[PDB]
Amino acid sequence: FRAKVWSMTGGPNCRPKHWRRNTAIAMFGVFLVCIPIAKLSAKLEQRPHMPVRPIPSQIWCKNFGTKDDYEKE
Amino acid sequence: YEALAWLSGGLGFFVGLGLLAVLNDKASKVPFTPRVYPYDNLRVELGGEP
Amino acid sequence: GGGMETNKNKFIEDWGSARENLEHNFRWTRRNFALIGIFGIALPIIVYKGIVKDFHMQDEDAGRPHRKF
Amino acid sequence: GFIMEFAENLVLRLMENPEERDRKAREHIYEMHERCKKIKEMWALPIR
Amino acid sequence: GRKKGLPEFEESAPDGFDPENPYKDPVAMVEMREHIVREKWIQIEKAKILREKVKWCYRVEGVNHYQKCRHLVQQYLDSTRGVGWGKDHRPIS
Amino acid sequence: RWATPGHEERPKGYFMNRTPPAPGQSRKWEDWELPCYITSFLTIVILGVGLNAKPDLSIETWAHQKALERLEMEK
Amino acid sequence: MYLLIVFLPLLGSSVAGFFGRFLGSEGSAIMTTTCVSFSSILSLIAFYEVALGASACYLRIAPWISSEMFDASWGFLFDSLTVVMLIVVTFISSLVHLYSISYMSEDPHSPRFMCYLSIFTFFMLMLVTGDNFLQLFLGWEGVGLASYLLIHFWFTRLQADKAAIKAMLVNRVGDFGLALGILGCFTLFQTVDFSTIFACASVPRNSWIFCNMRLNAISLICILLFIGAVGKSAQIGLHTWLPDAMEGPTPVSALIHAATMVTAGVFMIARCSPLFEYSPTALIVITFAGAMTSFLAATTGILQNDLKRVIAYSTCSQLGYMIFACGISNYSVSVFHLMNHAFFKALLFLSAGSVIHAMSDEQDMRKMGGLASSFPLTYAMMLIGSLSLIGFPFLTGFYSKDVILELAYTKYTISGNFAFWLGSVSVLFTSYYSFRLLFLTFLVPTNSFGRDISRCHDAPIPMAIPLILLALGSLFVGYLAKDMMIGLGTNFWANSLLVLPKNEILAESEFAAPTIIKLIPILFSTLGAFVAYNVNLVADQFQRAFQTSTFCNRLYSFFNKRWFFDQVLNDFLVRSFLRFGYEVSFEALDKGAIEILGPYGISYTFRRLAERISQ
Amino acid sequence: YFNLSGLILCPVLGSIILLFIPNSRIRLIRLIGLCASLITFLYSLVLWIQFDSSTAKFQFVESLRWLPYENINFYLGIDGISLFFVILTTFLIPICILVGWSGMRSYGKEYIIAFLICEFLMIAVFCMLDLLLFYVFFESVLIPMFIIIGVWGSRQRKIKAAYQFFLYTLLGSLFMLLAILLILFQTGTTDLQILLTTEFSERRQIFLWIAFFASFAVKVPMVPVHIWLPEAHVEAPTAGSVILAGILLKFGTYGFLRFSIPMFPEATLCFTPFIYTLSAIAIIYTSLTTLRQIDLKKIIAYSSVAHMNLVTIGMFSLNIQGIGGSILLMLSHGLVSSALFLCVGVLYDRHKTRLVRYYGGLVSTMPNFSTIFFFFTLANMSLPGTSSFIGEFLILVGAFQRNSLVATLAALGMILGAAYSLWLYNRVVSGNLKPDFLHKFSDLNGREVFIFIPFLVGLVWMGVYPKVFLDCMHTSVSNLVQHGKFH
Ligand SMILES: CCCCCCCCCCCCCCCCCC(=O)O[C@@H](COC(=O)CCCCCCCCCCCCCCC)COP(=O)(O)OCC[N+](C)(C)C
Ligand SMILES: CCCCCCCCCCCCCCCCCCCC(=O)O[C@H](COC(=O)CCCCCCCCCCCCCC)COP(=O)(O)OCCN
């Protein structure tokens, strides 16, 4: 009787024929919506400290070494 | 109801052994002296007044 | 086997619509008096006294005299 | 156009004058409180 | 029907309210009541801004925050004595 | 078993238990659906471009600007 | 980039759960695990750019509760302390995800499992990265919710349902203290954030007005926070849940029972370091409770004859050890033992699951005998894990247990000596039942059945790579991390962990060692090895079965039933509550007593008064 | 110029049109009723756009004379508090129409008449500044609820259920009416703006506060008087029973905010421990009573009783955050309890058992209903991330800041909330499946699936970002807390 119930999260052994095709779309779907999360975060991540060594996050970020004083917040 | 009788003994060993650590007084058995810092035990860097 | 409703077992119907009406049982008995006098007049009074005592102790720490309430 | 031009203007014309609202409330309070004493004196009249 | 800017109601004081007889001018008592909250929110907000001052101070100085923020810690602790309606020590406004 | 095709022609179960009709025709929307759907869309648009159009006037931003220009007067 | 560390597991879980019919039982398995591995790589990058490139990262998304001077925000605290636990949670979560795909290939409801696992990963990432008490509280409650969901993975299983319900109630009663703690610390500081209270957390010195009598303020807050951590660390107060928690699937248990939710209660203390050090009273009771729980679990695990049950008590013993480490202001060994534990007990959990599901799903000591030569891989793995567990000299576990016991000995406080004694006597118990596990299985004549041995299948390759990675870790990580983070004033923690000048005993924990106490737990370990080998391999004719008259069967029952806690607590608290919720509140308060004003109370009153008025 | 008059007129027009529609035209009756309800909902939403959350005084007011000397008159208006209640009242009713949509043929047009009548009736309650007419519309809701409970009750025992719900309300109503008469005879008018600015006598303050508490302690279920809600609430139709806990339960609790706290500043302070000692023991006693229950409807009603007793603590704890948290908790409860009664009523409309013994293993089937039920149970389970937790955290904060003892007892409520709701969830939709009783059963179709969508979106929206709700009413709460005193 398992075929009658929808089981929105997938049936017990739900094995679609083109599951690879859907997985490719799903993985592509995550990546395309992950960019706005990364892009919107670039205006964030305030770290006033300057690391002793250069990190690889200087290209997309500028909120480091600028918020030095705390008298004009 | 017999379990509560064993319950009292089980926790009694813990507190009983806890009291035994008071009967030896290891606080006075330190082989060294209390730690001391410069500048009034680092008064400026721990609060107080500059 | 075409009835969507439950079978409504006889032994369950009484269990269901018996606890719904307990006024007949809980009218006058010895244990009821003790239970009511220990959990409807006793506990509310104790917690009310605790609350007013807490308010009084809060007032004393600030120094202001306690209100009569 | 764009949604700001079509929304900000409508909202700010729908707000309807906050200061005049407070003024109207003030004179309403004063006027009805004055009428209250008149009503009390109306009730103070004896039957005879 | 408003200007696009932030509103400004009144700042100086309500003249009608007299403390000796609080219920003497009902028209002006509500003005005093709203002025009290509109002036207490200023203190609440400046407490918030000094809180962010302290928070960024602790977030910048490092391990030496027990000797380079005491001038702001004392400006926070005394600002919580009479801020808002939060503790039974109501401010004497 | 990572290369074999799945043994399922269609995901099991019916969405909202509504049996799809014969191919070619639409779903035959029900009487309540259209007004409820258009009202949902109107609610979404009003709460979207109305809430993010109301000027931020409150007791928080006014107090913020006032205390920003009043804490600076320490002298 | 830093948002991708947290939101990607949530996104993967949401898309897998919503579209678990679009993706097969393997599509979600290869998708959610890939997303979690990407998050793990991001966490490793953050560790490289923060732990070594010492510059903590701070952010704020949006105001959550923007009430008056109660600023709640969605910001995170990517601090040096936090990123170590980012590594710990992400690496183990990805390895568990790889572990489960082999195990769950037979279990039907596969995609829901990785959905739940990714929900847990997102919740605990939110917890550890959090910087506000209330915003940490959502992670605190979400960890419990995911624990309930995962133990309730088997809705048909009746035992799992009761275990999940009882776990939820006991965890709620536990974090009751922490929940009170958020607003306890708020009434003194008028704020909830971390950076604004760790700046000035020592200034308040007043008292309060509690329910009964006036007590201290900071000490009460720390006591409440510790009581909250009790629920999520199976301390002496409420540890009824963890021993009965292994009623669900195995791969989750390697992540919820011995790896990460273990770290919640200890990380409560670790995060709020400059709050407990200013409450010396709370530290002492914390030490008492930690030592008591550690000893209780260590002596609990020895009698039980199940794979998962005994190792849960080992986990609770490590919980007690870590709670004591956090109780003596020596939080360094606490986090070091946390990092070690997340390796050498997760590894053992994977090994136990591998030997359980490959042997017709049997987890027993009395019935299953020896099959070590049948498969050497996962036994070598579990042997390495056990050697770490006992802390054999110059291994990963030694560098934590040795230093924590030495720190216990050094502090001369009334709690330091007592708890050091308890830890020293618990080392014997732990080295006893660990080798009991090593001996009753794989080193005895096979006592199993003749059908299961024929149906033998070793650990599949995809589930063996996580074991390989964990074995590679918990053999070099101890040596690599001994110097860099417990090295007498290492400059990478910065403000993450603060230790007061007064209670700083580290240098004299190494340069004042008598050398007759530092190397003694190895002596208890070898004595436990000797006695376990003698009892369980050769001298078992009388040392095993004791058919005496009295006081010996009851000794067996006392430790098998774990001090009758499940009996006395149940009957005297929850049975009484359920009895008096029907025979008190529903009898003499509302239904029956004051119901003399509703039906049959006044209705019949007016059937006499109104009747005798027409005549 | 979307004023308050149209918001009340529109349901009246909807009811009037429905009166003269033949019973045969069942197609038109439901359509026009739903359209009227949705137009009312949109007209309420547009008010939030033009709310102007800046002024301490009242928003759009409509004055209509009621006595020859304009002594007392219909004086409309919202300030910062009744706005959200008006919005939620206008939002719940279309859900009531939608849930009772399939079986409208038996119900007839009289089903929508009562619902729309009560609709504009509760609309006229929240935005009613005049004190006496607030009582006229406060007890006007007796007739629609009486009719809904009686005519379309589920079982035959509905006769006794309605009598309690009626008479318990009338007793307190007339006790309040006496206080209203005393106030009017003393002051002279009943307009709210003036009556808040009158110096009262301390001896008179206590008596009038008690007189108001006579009824306001019945609307919110208190320890002495809470029997009516379960008996008269399990025995009501799902579309009708969903507003007894939806809007009919928020009158007295909200009535405290508008007509008790700023009205009697010196009496609430003197009676604060009494409310604490009532509500703190209520949250314990009712919660314990909830555990030993078998009916599916009664457990949700008891949880609602506990939630109201919790919000009462945070309301009388005068704090700028306590009252705001009280309003947030009341809105969140109005959402979650409504959702829970729809969730437990959709089961009844298919099987008609209302017993947890029969229900079991409903995850192996109808999984969508199981997911929705789990989400709403978590919302009732008081988890952070949902709108409730924002609701009671502020209550606890406000209570602890004033009294330490009351906060612990209140938080015992959210500790004990995990004992009955989770047990119900695991005992109804996660047990062992039994084919002996539930022989066959379907899942949620497109109607009840769309019914929960606004509930879910509002729940998440007010749980993760409650800023707008708090933003819109910080001025009004500040004005309410600071009253009578000047320090
Ligand atoms: C603290 C609250 C946070 C917000 C709450 C959401 C958090 C997740 C809560 C839901 C988790 C899943 C629990 C669903 C019910 C579990 C039992 C059940 O009914 O299972 C259903 C439902 O299955 C699911 O688990 C669906 C999960 C959907 C939830 C995905 C969303 C979770 C992430 C959202 C969190 C909010 C993100 C932040 C938003 C700003 C079907 O499962 P099957 O595998 O098909 O087995 C049924 C047997 N038979 C096939 C025969 C019918
Ligand atoms: C299954 C399909 C369901 C479709 C629903 C959408 C699909 C996604 C569902 C996921 C849940 C999303 C829920 C919305 C979360 C929004 C969280 C942030 C909202 C917020 O606080 O910002 C506000 C945005 O306004 C806005 O525009 C908010 C619009 C939200 C519309 C939601 C309509 C729900 C109506 C329910 C009514 C219930 C009434 C109960 C009382 C304004 O914030 P601001 O003031 O800072 O402005 C800024 C000026 N600088």
Tab-separated table of C-alpha atoms in Angstrom, chain G residues 275-559:
chain	number	residue	atom	x	y	z
G	275	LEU	CA	32.316	34.255	34.039
G	276	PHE	CA	32.988	31.070	36.028
G	277	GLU	CA	36.476	32.103	37.169
G	278	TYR	CA	34.886	35.033	39.027
G	279	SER	CA	32.497	32.619	40.793
G	280	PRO	CA	34.788	30.339	42.824
G	281	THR	CA	31.812	28.779	44.625
G	282	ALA	CA	30.384	27.388	41.379
G	283	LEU	CA	33.756	25.955	40.337
G	284	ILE	CA	33.963	23.777	43.454
G	285	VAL	CA	30.513	22.227	43.012
G	286	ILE	CA	31.293	21.793	39.304
G	287	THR	CA	34.401	19.817	40.265
G	288	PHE	CA	32.438	17.682	42.736
G	289	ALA	CA	29.729	16.888	40.188
G	290	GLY	CA	32.219	16.147	37.414
G	291	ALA	CA	34.314	13.785	39.519
G	292	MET	CA	31.217	12.057	40.896
G	293	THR	CA	29.749	11.540	37.420
G	294	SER	CA	33.062	10.306	36.008
G	295	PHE	CA	33.535	7.737	38.771
G	296	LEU	CA	29.883	6.674	38.616
G	297	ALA	CA	30.033	6.045	34.869
G	298	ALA	CA	33.429	4.328	35.063
G	299	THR	CA	32.152	1.840	37.630
G	300	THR	CA	28.838	1.609	35.753
G	301	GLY	CA	30.203	0.420	32.430
G	302	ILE	CA	32.030	-2.652	33.705
G	303	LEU	CA	29.053	-4.956	34.339
G	304	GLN	CA	27.059	-4.220	31.177
G	305	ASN	CA	27.391	-6.701	28.302
G	306	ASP	CA	26.482	-4.629	25.230
G	307	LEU	CA	28.692	-2.874	22.692
G	308	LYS	CA	26.909	0.490	22.745
G	309	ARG	CA	25.784	0.510	26.385
G	310	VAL	CA	29.232	0.154	27.969
G	311	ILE	CA	30.887	2.709	25.686
G	312	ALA	CA	28.152	5.199	26.573
G	313	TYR	CA	29.325	4.956	30.178
G	314	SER	CA	32.886	5.483	28.954
G	315	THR	CA	31.626	8.615	27.205
G	316	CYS	CA	29.987	9.736	30.454
G	317	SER	CA	33.251	9.121	32.330
G	318	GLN	CA	35.047	11.339	29.815
G	319	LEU	CA	32.232	13.855	30.363
G	320	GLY	CA	33.005	13.839	34.076
G	321	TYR	CA	36.727	14.241	33.426
G	322	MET	CA	36.107	17.186	31.091
G	323	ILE	CA	33.658	18.811	33.516
G	324	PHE	CA	36.334	18.614	36.202
G	325	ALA	CA	38.851	20.073	33.750
G	326	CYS	CA	36.455	22.995	33.274
G	327	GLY	CA	35.945	23.138	37.051
G	328	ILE	CA	39.527	23.919	38.086
G	329	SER	CA	40.024	26.883	35.694
G	330	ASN	CA	42.219	24.521	33.634
G	331	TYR	CA	40.098	24.751	30.504
G	332	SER	CA	43.103	23.920	28.301
G	333	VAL	CA	43.056	20.209	29.095
G	334	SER	CA	39.260	20.342	28.793
G	335	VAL	CA	39.299	21.366	25.131
G	336	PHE	CA	42.357	19.198	24.426
G	337	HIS	CA	40.553	16.133	25.779
G	338	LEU	CA	37.466	17.223	23.830
G	339	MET	CA	39.428	17.244	20.574
G	340	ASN	CA	41.020	13.890	21.401
G	341	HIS	CA	37.683	12.360	22.457
G	342	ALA	CA	35.917	13.379	19.253
G	343	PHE	CA	38.533	11.245	17.475
G	344	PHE	CA	39.148	8.193	19.634
G	345	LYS	CA	35.533	7.559	20.613
G	346	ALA	CA	33.965	8.340	17.248
G	347	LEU	CA	36.463	5.860	15.789
G	348	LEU	CA	35.438	3.229	18.328
G	349	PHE	CA	31.768	3.903	17.587
G	350	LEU	CA	32.330	3.371	13.857
G	351	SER	CA	34.265	0.177	14.595
G	352	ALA	CA	31.502	-1.122	16.874
G	353	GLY	CA	28.875	-0.378	14.239
G	354	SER	CA	30.985	-2.064	11.567
G	355	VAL	CA	31.309	-5.229	13.643
G	356	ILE	CA	27.622	-5.075	14.627
G	357	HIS	CA	25.958	-4.719	11.227
G	358	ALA	CA	28.381	-7.200	9.629
G	359	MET	CA	27.438	-9.898	12.174
G	360	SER	CA	23.674	-10.137	11.566
G	361	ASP	CA	22.956	-7.022	13.668
G	362	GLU	CA	23.940	-8.383	17.087
G	363	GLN	CA	25.380	-6.237	19.895
G	364	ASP	CA	26.200	-8.513	22.827
G	365	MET	CA	29.084	-9.738	24.980
G	366	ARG	CA	27.586	-12.869	26.556
G	367	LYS	CA	26.671	-14.457	23.204
G	368	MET	CA	29.228	-13.301	20.629
G	369	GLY	CA	32.687	-14.800	21.052
G	370	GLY	CA	35.833	-14.343	18.985
G	371	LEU	CA	36.254	-13.640	15.268
G	372	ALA	CA	39.343	-11.398	15.208
G	373	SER	CA	41.210	-13.320	12.501
G	374	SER	CA	38.109	-13.240	10.280
G	375	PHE	CA	38.837	-9.548	9.619
G	376	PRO	CA	41.883	-7.586	10.838
G	377	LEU	CA	41.094	-4.101	9.518
G	378	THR	CA	38.405	-2.760	11.836
G	379	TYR	CA	39.845	-4.693	14.774
G	380	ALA	CA	43.176	-2.964	14.205
G	381	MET	CA	41.199	0.279	14.060
G	382	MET	CA	39.345	-0.411	17.316
G	383	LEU	CA	42.563	-1.590	18.984
G	384	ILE	CA	44.185	1.741	18.110
G	385	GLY	CA	41.105	3.524	19.429
G	386	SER	CA	41.179	1.560	22.680
G	387	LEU	CA	44.912	2.188	23.111
G	388	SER	CA	44.078	5.882	22.822
G	389	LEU	CA	41.176	5.415	25.265
G	390	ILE	CA	43.374	3.959	28.019
G	391	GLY	CA	45.990	6.524	27.015
G	392	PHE	CA	48.975	4.263	26.499
G	393	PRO	CA	52.202	6.251	27.027
G	394	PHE	CA	53.129	8.488	24.087
G	395	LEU	CA	49.742	8.243	22.354
G	396	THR	CA	46.962	10.739	21.679
G	397	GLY	CA	44.916	9.892	24.774
G	398	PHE	CA	47.936	9.897	27.087
G	399	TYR	CA	48.728	13.567	26.396
G	400	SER	CA	45.277	14.502	27.757
G	401	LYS	CA	44.612	12.056	30.597
G	402	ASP	CA	48.119	12.383	32.050
G	403	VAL	CA	48.043	16.182	32.110
G	404	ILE	CA	44.471	16.353	33.428
G	405	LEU	CA	45.292	13.959	36.276
G	406	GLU	CA	48.438	15.950	37.067
G	407	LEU	CA	46.384	19.157	37.155
G	408	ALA	CA	43.913	17.399	39.452
G	409	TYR	CA	46.756	16.451	41.802
G	410	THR	CA	48.379	19.896	41.809
G	411	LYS	CA	45.419	21.968	42.991
G	412	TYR	CA	45.224	21.546	46.770
G	413	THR	CA	41.639	22.790	47.130
G	414	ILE	CA	39.140	20.580	48.943
G	415	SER	CA	37.756	19.590	45.538
G	416	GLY	CA	41.103	19.142	43.786
G	417	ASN	CA	42.363	16.376	46.068
G	418	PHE	CA	39.032	14.536	46.288
G	419	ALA	CA	38.490	14.626	42.539
G	420	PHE	CA	42.093	13.622	41.853
G	421	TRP	CA	41.555	10.588	44.083
G	422	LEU	CA	38.334	9.791	42.228
G	423	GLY	CA	40.002	10.123	38.825
G	424	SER	CA	42.939	7.959	39.885
G	425	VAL	CA	40.610	5.208	41.094
G	426	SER	CA	38.458	5.586	37.955
G	427	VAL	CA	41.464	5.044	35.679
G	428	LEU	CA	41.556	1.474	36.989
G	429	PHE	CA	37.873	0.962	36.156
G	430	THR	CA	38.150	2.433	32.660
G	431	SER	CA	41.262	0.402	31.829
G	432	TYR	CA	39.412	-2.618	33.211
G	433	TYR	CA	36.242	-2.463	31.137
G	434	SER	CA	38.020	-1.261	27.979
G	435	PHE	CA	40.174	-4.392	28.030
G	436	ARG	CA	37.104	-6.391	29.077
G	437	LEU	CA	35.578	-5.226	25.797
G	438	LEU	CA	38.794	-6.112	23.974
G	439	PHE	CA	38.763	-9.601	25.546
G	440	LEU	CA	35.133	-10.789	25.727
G	441	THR	CA	35.049	-10.199	21.964
G	442	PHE	CA	37.600	-11.337	19.378
G	443	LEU	CA	39.797	-13.011	22.032
G	444	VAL	CA	37.553	-15.861	23.232
G	445	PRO	CA	36.166	-19.047	21.694
G	446	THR	CA	33.253	-18.125	19.456
G	447	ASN	CA	30.000	-18.546	21.393
G	448	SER	CA	27.763	-17.263	18.575
G	449	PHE	CA	25.515	-19.303	16.277
G	450	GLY	CA	26.566	-21.321	13.248
G	451	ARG	CA	24.469	-19.381	10.738
G	452	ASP	CA	25.795	-15.872	11.398
G	453	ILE	CA	29.440	-16.905	10.974
G	454	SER	CA	28.711	-18.265	7.493
G	455	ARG	CA	26.965	-14.987	6.592
G	456	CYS	CA	30.086	-12.898	7.169
G	457	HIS	CA	30.898	-9.781	5.142
G	458	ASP	CA	33.662	-7.335	6.055
G	459	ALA	CA	33.409	-3.549	6.189
G	460	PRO	CA	32.727	-2.049	2.736
G	461	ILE	CA	35.286	0.367	1.326
G	462	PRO	CA	33.237	3.625	1.513
G	463	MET	CA	32.615	3.074	5.237
G	464	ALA	CA	36.275	2.186	5.880
G	465	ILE	CA	37.748	5.483	4.638
G	466	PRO	CA	36.301	7.424	7.623
G	467	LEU	CA	37.876	4.822	9.912
G	468	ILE	CA	41.198	5.240	8.089
G	469	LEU	CA	41.002	9.016	8.480
G	470	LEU	CA	40.148	8.785	12.186
G	471	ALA	CA	42.985	6.308	12.777
G	472	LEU	CA	45.396	8.643	10.986
G	473	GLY	CA	44.133	11.492	13.160
G	474	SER	CA	44.100	9.965	16.633
G	475	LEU	CA	47.716	8.868	16.381
G	476	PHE	CA	49.402	12.148	15.356
G	477	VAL	CA	46.964	14.843	16.529
G	478	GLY	CA	47.921	14.378	20.180
G	479	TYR	CA	51.611	14.909	19.471
G	480	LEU	CA	50.872	17.783	17.090
G	481	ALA	CA	48.571	19.596	19.540
G	482	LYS	CA	50.452	18.931	22.787
G	483	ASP	CA	52.914	21.777	22.241
G	484	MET	CA	50.904	24.293	20.242
G	485	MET	CA	47.914	24.764	22.563
G	486	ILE	CA	49.007	23.525	26.006
G	487	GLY	CA	52.521	24.943	26.011
G	488	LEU	CA	52.721	27.306	28.997
G	489	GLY	CA	51.288	30.479	27.504
G	490	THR	CA	50.574	29.858	23.819
G	491	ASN	CA	49.539	33.004	21.932
G	492	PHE	CA	46.697	31.879	19.689
G	493	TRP	CA	43.762	31.780	22.103
G	494	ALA	CA	43.874	35.564	22.741
G	495	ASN	CA	40.478	36.468	24.290
G	496	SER	CA	38.898	33.099	23.441
G	497	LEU	CA	39.933	31.529	26.759
G	498	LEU	CA	40.817	33.725	29.737
G	499	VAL	CA	42.499	32.366	32.877
G	500	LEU	CA	42.731	34.495	36.005
G	501	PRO	CA	46.189	35.233	37.447
G	502	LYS	CA	45.315	33.708	40.829
G	503	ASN	CA	44.121	30.254	39.717
G	504	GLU	CA	46.810	29.543	37.112
G	505	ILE	CA	48.662	26.342	38.038
G	506	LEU	CA	50.313	24.978	34.884
G	507	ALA	CA	54.103	25.332	35.123
G	508	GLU	CA	54.225	23.665	38.546
G	509	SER	CA	51.990	20.916	37.148
G	510	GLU	CA	55.019	19.811	35.101
G	511	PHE	CA	58.132	21.116	36.896
G	512	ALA	CA	56.920	20.108	40.380
G	513	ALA	CA	55.775	16.593	39.462
G	514	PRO	CA	56.965	14.013	42.039
G	515	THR	CA	57.344	11.426	39.209
G	516	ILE	CA	55.726	8.907	41.569
G	517	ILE	CA	52.250	10.208	40.688
G	518	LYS	CA	52.586	11.295	37.037
G	519	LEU	CA	53.279	7.750	35.790
G	520	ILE	CA	50.924	5.953	38.218
G	521	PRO	CA	47.793	5.816	35.968
G	522	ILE	CA	49.820	3.640	33.607
G	523	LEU	CA	50.304	1.388	36.638
G	524	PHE	CA	46.559	1.166	37.269
G	525	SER	CA	46.122	0.562	33.531
G	526	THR	CA	48.501	-2.403	33.516
G	527	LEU	CA	46.970	-3.764	36.737
G	528	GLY	CA	43.537	-3.570	35.120
G	529	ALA	CA	44.943	-5.312	32.054
G	530	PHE	CA	46.321	-8.110	34.234
G	531	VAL	CA	43.126	-8.589	36.241
G	532	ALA	CA	40.870	-8.431	33.169
G	533	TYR	CA	43.016	-10.943	31.277
G	534	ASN	CA	43.120	-13.276	34.287
G	535	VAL	CA	39.371	-13.116	34.938
G	536	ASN	CA	38.125	-13.210	31.338
G	537	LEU	CA	40.609	-15.616	29.731
G	538	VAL	CA	41.993	-18.147	32.231
G	539	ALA	CA	40.803	-17.717	35.830
G	540	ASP	CA	37.054	-17.762	35.220
G	541	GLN	CA	36.087	-20.954	37.078
G	542	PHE	CA	35.042	-19.009	40.191
G	543	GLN	CA	35.990	-15.402	39.424
G	544	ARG	CA	33.211	-15.151	36.803
G	545	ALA	CA	30.041	-16.721	38.257
G	546	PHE	CA	29.289	-16.108	41.947
G	547	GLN	CA	26.456	-18.385	43.103
G	548	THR	CA	26.692	-17.350	46.745
G	549	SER	CA	23.823	-16.939	49.204
G	550	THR	CA	23.242	-13.184	49.496
G	551	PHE	CA	24.868	-9.737	49.061
G	552	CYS	CA	26.566	-10.876	45.816
G	553	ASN	CA	23.575	-11.216	43.489
G	554	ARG	CA	22.364	-7.862	44.816
G	555	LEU	CA	25.829	-6.467	44.104
G	556	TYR	CA	25.357	-7.648	40.515
G	557	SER	CA	21.916	-6.018	40.329
G	558	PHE	CA	23.055	-2.748	41.931
G	559	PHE	CA	25.494	-1.940	39.128
